[PDB]
């Protein structure tokens, strides 16, 4: 599905209105870097298998499929938690999760007669393409 690595940092917390403070990790965003004369060896090792630098509808179109794979993976992973908490196999983490998943279900959009009036953009792509 994606990236190989994760990075975490340790901090205490207020935890609640009132339950014991503790120590746990939080995520921090992560990225893979490069430098001069480390990339040259990589590029040499990877010469046999290569892909188009930009691609002409043969690389952009694949990306969309990959994206849909990832999205569906995440959405399926939500079940494995929320279903088993509904079974009562584990206690509710009321403090955080549900508030975020109220926000989520709030944030989608809708096709409401006013948005579809921005139909007038598809056609102006086509009268430059076709």
């Amino acid at each position: 599905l994606g990236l190989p690595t994760e990075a975490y940092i340790s901090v205490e917390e207020v935890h609640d209105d009132g339950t014991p403070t503790s120590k746990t990790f939080e995520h921090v965003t992560s990225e893979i870097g490069a430098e001069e004369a480390e990339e040259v060896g990589v590029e040499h090792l990877l010469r046999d298998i290569k892909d188009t630098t930009v691609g002409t509808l043969s690389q952009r179109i694949t990306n969309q499929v990959h994206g849909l794979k990832g999205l569906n993976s995440k959405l399926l992973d939500i079940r494995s938690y929320l279903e088993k908490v509904a079974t009562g196999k584990l206690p509710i983490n009321h403090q955080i999760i549900y508030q975020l998943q109220d926000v989520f279900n709030l944030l989608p959009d809708v096709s409401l007669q006013e948005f579809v009036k921005a139909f007038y953009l598809k056609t102006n792509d086509q009268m430059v393409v076709v």
Partner: protein, 94 residues
């Protein structure tokens, strides 16, 4: 309570439910907005309040069982689309 599609509240429902005279409802709503409990905007001349929101509330297990199905639709939908595109364009993407 209202199902997101109808997130516009007429003044009269507010006045009926809070037991206040109509001329005052505006001030009530304004106070709320300023504390930061809700963040819509109001049109006085159609006399409707248009609400979008940011604050959660505490939720019990029955609602959890409920929203599981609403979440469940979404994954079938996504998989249907990825299957449609894969079949329609294996010729090019191979």
């Amino acid at each position: 309570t209202r199902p997101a599609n109808h997130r516009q509240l007429t003044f009269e429902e507010i006045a009926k439910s809070a037991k206040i005279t109509v001329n005052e409802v505006e001030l009530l709503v304004m106070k709320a907005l300023s504390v930061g409990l809700v963040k819509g905007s109001i049109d006085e001349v159609d006399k409707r309040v248009h609400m979008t929101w940011v604050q959660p509330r505490v939720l019990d297990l029955q609602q959890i069982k409920g929203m599981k199905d609403r979440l469940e639709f979404w994954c079938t939908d996504v998989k249907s689309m990825e299957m449609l595109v894969e079949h329609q364009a294996h010729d090019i993407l191979t």
